[PDB]
Design a protein around this nucleic acid. Structure first.
Ligand SMILES: Nc1ncnc2c1ncn2[C@@H]1O[C@H](C[C@@H](N)CC[C@H](N)C(=O)O)[C@@H](O)[C@H]1O
Length: 461
RNA sequence: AGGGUAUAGCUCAGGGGUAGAGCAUUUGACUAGAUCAAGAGGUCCCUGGUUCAAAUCCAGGUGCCCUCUCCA
């Protein structure tokens, strides 16, 4: 609708093109169709998901209670607007709030401000602009000025600049709470509110300091993964790549905090974020460690990692990925070598995971990318190198089936869960569209118009 | 068969030979700054290799990073 295609390097876009236009897809669909599918995808990746999905912390508050509190909250934030809060029938602990946008009738002010691309993407998802996000502002900006926020999607604005000739994207208008001086004078690493969004292009609730113990902002497929893994209370679970611990805390909540959830991560601060989250939401079965997942299998001769092989009941490999399925992602200035730089690491982590898995155990491999080399190909490779593993059907089945190209059978592809951003057209929701909307339409919208994601389920013998 | 990155206080260009921009900071002028001018600034991460010569190219080392909703 409103935004152009995702600004990719020619080589990168041609890489992905090679991915989506392979011999098998061309055979089963034709070039004229597959190409349009690809372009539709690239057109969709620039726009926010049409649904703000919120995971309920069932270990501290029920879904009903949280829903009511969030009704009061939306009553407060939207000055008494009327947006519904659906409850997913398949994902029992997930709430859905529709996104009101885009709004093309926003009048652009003269006082401007430029945020980081990531900050912009956050704002489109219903976030305000906090001080560390602003990388540019009109030199005459005072606290209280109604300013227009623009997103430096290319990430080319050098911080502190008073002018920018590069690529900007209008995010909406907001009331500033800081002058340009207060932000760029001296070097105070200051925090807090910077720009209170009052007229965003996409209208979504702000989830900063609201019910921190009860909520967790989480994409629908991400919340789905922990359900697919299906952890039972009392088991031993381990997710190699865990931080900041969304799926970790979710797993812990699904087990009623009864069992043992070991979370690993490579970066220290990230592990600290895991611990902070677990302590916040009230989960005690979570134990986080700063450790290389590729070297997590015991070899030398000495409860901390590394662990003995076949010592975990269930393992979640939420492997690091290109993140090409991210929405909204209006631009990506990556090298092709950078985009395809993940398959080896994913394979190492996968091997380490299989070694650490008990027989009859479950291994769930999940990415947030769209590439074949990081998804279906990794499944084929996994089923080839490890013959003990065997692909399993999943519950709940929500996303589409696997993409042809890895040489898998249709029976195998039906057991994968690939979420396609180009599944359904972009819904330009407004209040009139809200009122005359069948619920079964909204649910399908929430299930289809999502970020790029891929889930695969394995069992050991 | 993992990758990217290290340059001025901050944010980043550049590039085999005399160190660059924006902002911040300093000074002067004009009526504290939506004004003008002026200069202050860096063993270019460590080590080794190629080379007449490496801040630049190569290798190793180390630090930081590779969002899977919101202090960016
Ligand atoms: N070799 C590695 N071993 C363990 N963790 C890694 C490794 N490389 C990257 N990571 C971590 O993988 C994480 C990828 C995250 N997106 C995981 C998100 C997490 N699954 C969640 O749902 O909240 C990064 O934060 C990395 O710190």
């Amino acid at each position: 609708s409103i935004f152009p295609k995702i600004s990719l390097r020619p080589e990168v876009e041609n890489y992905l093109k090679e991915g989506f236009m392979n011999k098998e897809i061309v055979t089963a669909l034709g070039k004229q169709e597959a190409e349009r599918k690809f372009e539709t995808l690239l057109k969709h990746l620039s726009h926010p998901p049409s649904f703000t999905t919120v995971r309920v912390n069932t270990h501290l508050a029920s879904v009903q209670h949280v829903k009511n509190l969030l009704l009061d909250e939306l009553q407060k934030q939207f000055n008494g607007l009327s947006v519904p809060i659906l409850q997913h029938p398949d994902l029992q602990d997930v709430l859905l709030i529709p996104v009101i946008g885009p709004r093309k009738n926003i009048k652009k002010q003269q006082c401007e401000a430029i945020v980081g691309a990531q900050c912009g993407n956050a704002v489109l998802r219903g976030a305000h602009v906090y001080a560390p996000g602003i990388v540019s502002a009109s030199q005459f900006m005072k606290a209280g000025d109604v300013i227009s926020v623009y997103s430096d999607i290319k990430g080319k604005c050098k911080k502190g600049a008073k002018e920018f000739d590069g690529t900007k994207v209008f995010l909406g208008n907001g009331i500033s709470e800081l002058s340009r001086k207060e932000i760029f004078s001296g070097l105070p690493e200051l925090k807090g509110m910077g720009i209170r969004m009052t007229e965003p292009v996409y209208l979504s609730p702000s989830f900063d300091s609201v019910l921190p113990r009860y909520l967790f902002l989480q994409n629908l497929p991400s919340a789905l993964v922990s359900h697919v893994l299906n952890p039972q209370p009392g088991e031993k679970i381990l997710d190699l790549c865990a931080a900041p611990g969304g799926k970790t805390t979710h797993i812990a909540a699904l087990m009623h905090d009864q069992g043992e959830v070991i979370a690993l991560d490579k970066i220290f601060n990230k592990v600290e974020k895991i611990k902070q989250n677990a302590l916040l939401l009230g989960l005690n079965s979570i134990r986080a460690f700063c450790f290389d997942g590729t070297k997590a299998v015991k070899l030398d001769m000495v409860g901390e990692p590394p662990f003995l092989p076949e010592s975990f009941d269930r393992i979640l490999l939420d492997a690091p990925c290109s993140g090409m399925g991210q929405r909204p992602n209006m631009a990506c200035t990556w090298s092709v070598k950078e985009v395809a730089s993940y398959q080896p690491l994913q394979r190492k982590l996968f091997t380490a995971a299989v070694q650490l898995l008990k027989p009859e155990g479950v291994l769930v491999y999940s990415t947030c990318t769209i590439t074949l080399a990081e998804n279906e190909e990794q499944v084929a490779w996994a089923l080839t190198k490890f013959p003990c593993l065997q692909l399993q059907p999943q519950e709940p089945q929500i996303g589409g089936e696997g993409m042809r190209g890895a040489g898998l059978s249709c029976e195998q592809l039906k057991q994968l869960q690939r979420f396609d951003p180009s599944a359904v057209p972009l819904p330009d929701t407004d209040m009139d569209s809200l009122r005359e909307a069948r619920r079964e339409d909204m649910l399908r919208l929430a299930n289809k118009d999502s970020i790029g994601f891929f889930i695969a389920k394995f069992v050991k013998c």
